[PDB]
Symmetry: D2
Subunit: 228 residues, 4 copies
């Protein structure tokens, strides 16, 4: 009974590796039927292989409303309606790309799943913010929280919660590349004196996803070791 | 499973007699913790001991008195081991009493358990704020203090966090007049009162090994109130 | 001496009416040379007429980097470099329009003026957020603050401050349209029990613009009568 | 000009002897306010009276004592008129003293001036927080209290706000060792200490008729610290 996701259908974007993956795997351990996603059909297959009987991969282009419609219809058809949504992850271009990837795509896919969730008076939307390395990332991240809080207020009456998980410095593929010099400047900024693990983000997501977290909405949960 | 297991942890829950304090203690016991729940009197401590059974016991505790703190912690150290998880729960006369109950006592007891936690490089301090001016000042004080303490001790494996409840279903709420209830709901977007279990769920999460990288956080459980 | 803007060149976007106007007028009273802007040349003339000797209107398209370059060169040529910048003011389209008007345009024009400001070790950038009526507006507004805080940190060392003024419910052209029924629901939400005046936003902007406010940066100043 | 003029206002500034308290009192006097600056002793009150001259005077004040509060306010009411602007400026022994100086005293004196301000539908209460754990808890308490009080009294024309300074140039900072100064700057993005005038500028703004729609705000003057 305690924090069990048996009977839930979870849509995890960006499920191929790292945080996206660690989330998908944990939600699977907790009993959820996990549809993890990737921008390509190959990545979707890699997702399908690690999930096995606990779900599958699907190719998804969040910039395209038809690709969204078809994925949700497909999920509704095999699994039931998505109960849990987890949204994962200088020129004029870097800006407009970050705003699309880290903000607009988070808005669009959130609005899309809500129809079905509010029909059921039950849903969980969780937006995972970008892990720290800035203006562009800061602007998008604060935009998501902005949006999360307003959407939270509009839908709380209909049994849907909308929350954000804000990671600090997390041990990932990229972070190992930063040399022993650049390593220490990162740890200097964290009171814990260590990088966070992708499992720790997944733990925060799964809690918020649980029936136990039904009265938590419009919250930003920081997982940063005191780097605030 | 190893997921969110508190087996091997000793939890001190203040204000454990009823409602939120009780719901916390019970859940931490379900998760495998050895729970010492507290009350201001020896009778309340007995009531606590009866509901916990083999998963812990009740102790009398006066947080305004440093000696009563010292003796409770030595007693817990003696029967159970050092406290691993601390849950701090609880005109002029209005003010100075609120500042003592909802702030100073939270400071004092937090500082007291820290010695042992930093020796182990492992601890959890969780301050539960008051249910929704004197209360506002105390509550903001705790978060103030939680954040500064969090920074000082994160290096030594201790996390310090706050859980901030909204409007929660209690003894108190059965006296809410016909539309006085309606008046309170109007402020909560979720359209309902929160359950004490939901506060306990938030506490137990933050208490878990899984929440090691969460410190200096305020976790609001309010159905959208803010 | 006290809060005097004599010797400052202020660029106020959206200066045609209401808040934009009230800002431009006040900064003019305080001694600044005010270039107020509008999307058209006609609006720019209307601006020029109310400012008189204290500045002028210029047509500006913030979505176009060339229109930005040319306006700044023109200001540099007649007045000196901009010392103070004040940035003023559901389909897929409503979203992407709000993100452009209330966020991307605020980023772009901010980045553009910074070159000259950091050469002088002196500048003021102030972003006025949208007045309240939501997800789209909330997302953009929180994005601006997000961006304001990161940019503030990057440039504070070089004598530039970057701040936000966040208005509540403000008495404007639009707000009078809301009927005597819809009027009271607005006042219900404000502890003050009244709408704010556009002068009150302009007062907050001009303070932050002053030499006196040199140690204020990365701040969101709320002018909302307690509606927080 | 009528811009940010405090002519006709009576301002009470606690902690007016030196530094920030002084810089505040002086500026509010330049803006035309009748400034009563305070000190814990009668000698300090005299020093205050000497620098203010015709723009106000010094009074001795013990914020821990309700009678000392009552008598100072009656005295101000008697010579100047009711206070229009209040600027609240200022082991176990460490803690309970900080909570009294930086929090309870702020509460008490705020509540005291409110009576007269709400009768006039016009007032300004401004709490200056401590310069950068006990301090964190007090400071967060004041903002806590500021926000709850702000909500309760905004309808009656009184605004209540906080100014939160960062690292400011004082007596204290001349004792900062060669690179201990450098260590403190490292945390401030502006690369410099703030001037007491800059705190006074923020206070005087919020004190102005222009700032009538600002209430329940924390105004940080920190060069980007946060």
């Amino acid at each position: 009974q305690f924090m069990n996701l048996e009977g839930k259908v979870a849509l995890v974007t960006g499920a191929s590796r790292g945080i996206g993956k660690a989330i998908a795997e944990l939600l699977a351990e907790r009993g959820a039927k996990v549809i993890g996603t990737a921008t390509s059909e190959s990545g979707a297959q890699a997702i399908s292989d690690y999930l096995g009987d606990n779900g599958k991969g699907m190719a998804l282009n969040v910039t395209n409303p038809e690709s969204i419609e078809a994925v949700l219809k497909a999920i509704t058809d095999e699994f039931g309606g998505v109960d849990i949504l987890v949204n994962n992850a200088m020129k004029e271009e870097e800006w407009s790309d970050i705003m699309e990837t880290n903000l607009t795509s988070i808005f669009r896919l959130s609005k899309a799943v809500l129809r079905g969730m509010m029909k059921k008076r039950q849903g969980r939307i969780i937006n995972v913010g970008s892990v720290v390395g800035a203006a562009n990332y800061a602007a998008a991240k604060a935009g998501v929280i902005g949006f999360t809080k307003s959407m939270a207020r509009e839908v709380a009456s209909r049994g849907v919660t909308v929350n954000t998980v804000a990671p600090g410095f997390i041990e990932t593929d990229m972070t190992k590349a930063l040399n022993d010099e650049q390593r220490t400047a990162t740890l200097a900024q964290v009171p814990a004196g260590r990088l966070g693990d992708p499992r720790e983000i997944a733990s925060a997501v799964a809690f918020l996803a649980s029936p136990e977290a039904a009265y938590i909405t419009g919250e930003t949960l920081h997982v940063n070791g005191g780097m605030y």
